[PDB]
């Protein structure tokens, strides 16, 4: 008997009930990752390749190796079933709409080919469908009802024991030679990416880095918009860190510092908010769209492709919004308050551009932008859905002025404006012609002009949205 | 081997292909001033077609929203839009 575990969104060896279940009594095992879009989306693929090399390095310690394969799963696995005589195929359960129809089609190919399919839940805390049935066959519309539901469920089981020396147990991985250059982990330059000007990784991918950051993150629990060395959101999305392990180590550490066996749901706010959008989208194949979405308000946005280009590329004329997009493009991550700032500038604040357009921009640059979380957030940031209570739009200039008056974050990612003082660093258009020449930066030549007047554009869109909700 | 065009190319992002960021647009472009009553009246017509495409909820889904959104409890406008 042979077996193959398909890796997709669980690039880790800890808490893997799908992988560990497949090696229980199989004679052969092989871990396979199927790797089948633009230029700026390089930090996304660099993160992924770092996780696969880390996943291969941890497999090398067990005298196994990772098998990276190009192509589509509907074409690759049918020939891997016969060339390897595969009997068992284990996968981590994917609740997303595209993932479910992809899994149901692959296992239909496997069941008719004599291959048994093993499915286990590891990317989420609970079984999302069990939460939907408690609500009445429909996922919760609000985060409030969602927290009421997760408290109405039996506690989670301990995460599956990590794959070690005995978990294998006389289970040979048939790593023949010629393995490299065929099943090896490609580089960024092998995918067609230009890495001549690429900087060092700010968010190093991999399972080892995730567990390292998790230990230091919990150690600092018992303002700044820069990247924190204890960030875990990209590793939760790519599956480098399991949410169930994050859950139990958050509980156990909370019981030690305190004496209360009833931790508030604010302790798992990062996981429950993450778990919420997975539940709200598993039964909604149009969750990433406005038209045809049962839980999205229809809004007549303006279609300005050139304005979307200025916003996405970080050339809007507002140093606050431009500094956020330059950090998003270069580092692949921005603060949550920064996400709220640039979303208002594009949706319900200034440009009046559809949230779907901003969803696809974050889809390529934001490292922790999962299909469920990234789609649901843009609906809430644009008041198009009702997941959480709304908030006032952020003025671009007068927002980060009190986070740091010098504009240290502005001069950080916008070196073209490094010669402006605090009275004009946030409003360079209101700067006199003399001070523009002494800084070697003229507005409209070296730095873009304000693509819109915030005073008129704000009151324009506020009245438009008043007309929308008063009509609803 | 005999694959004809083999030098693969990574194309630009979607927003750069659909649009055309002029090197002047990246500096000079500014959104035009709009007439308030004109843009509002045009949105009334487009909102008329987008009327039965609006989200329709059931009994439990409405009370589920009232515990979060006060404008669902009062019938007015949200606290963020009302400015």
Author numbering:
A (entry chain A): 3 to 38, 44 to 229, 242 to 491
B (entry chain B): 1125 to 1207
What does the paper say about this structure?
The basic helix-loop-helix PER-ARNT-SIM (bHLH-PAS) domain-containing transcription factor CLOCK:BMAL1 forms the positive component of the core feedback loop. PER and CRY proteins interact with each other to form a large complex with the kinase CK1δ and enter the nucleus after a delay to bind directly to CLOCK:BMAL1 and inhibit its activity. What structural features of CRY1 and CRY2 might lead to differential functions in the circadian clock? Both cryptochromes are defined by a highly conserved photolyase homology region (PHR) domain and divergent C-terminal tails that are intrinsically disordered. However, repression also relies on the recruitment of CRY1 to the PAS domain core of CLOCK:BMAL1 via the CLOCK PAS-B domain, which docks into the evolutionarily conserved secondary pocket on the CRY1 PHR domain.
In addition to binding near the BMAL1 TAD-binding site at the CC helix of CRY1 and CRY2, the PER2 CBD also wraps around the distal side of the PHR domain to come into close contact with the serine loop. To see if binding of the PER2 CBD truly alters the serine loop and secondary pocket of CRY1, we determined a crystal structure of the CRY1 PHR:PER2 CBD complex that eliminated this artifact. The overall conformation of the PER2 CBD in our structure is highly similar to the previously solved structure (0.76 Å Cɑ RMSD over PER2 residues 1136–1207). However, we now see that the serine loop maintains most of its flexibility in the PER2-bound state. Comparing the secondary binding pocket of the apo CRY1 PHR domain structure to our CRY1 PHR:PER2 CBD structure, we observed that PER2 CBD induces a modest structuring at the C-terminal end of the loop (residues 44–47). This reorganization is stabilized by an interaction between S45 on CRY1 and the backbone of Q1135 on the PER2 CBD. To determine if addition of the PER2 CBD alters binding between the CRY1 PHR domain and CLOCK:BMAL1, we utilized BLI binding assays using preformed CRY:PER2 CBD complexes with the immobilized PAS domain core and found that the CRY1:PER2 CBD complex binds with a ~ 3 fold reduction in affinity. Therefore, PER2 modestly weakens interaction of the CRY1 PHR domain with the CLOCK:BMAL1 PAS core, suggesting that this modest ordering of the CRY1 serine loop makes docking of the CLOCK PAS-B into the secondary pocket less favorable. Therefore, the addition of PER2 CBD causes the serine loops of CRY1 and CRY2 to take on a largely similar conformation, with the loop in CRY1 becoming more structured and the loop in CRY2 becoming less structured. Our data suggest that the differential effect of the PER2 CBD on CRY PHR binding to CLOCK:BMAL1 allows it to serve as a molecular equalizer—PER2 compensates for poorer binding by CRY2 by modestly enhancing its affinity for the transcription factor, while at the same time reducing CRY1 binding to bring the overall affinities of the two cryptochromes for the PAS domain core of CLOCK:BMAL1 to similar levels.
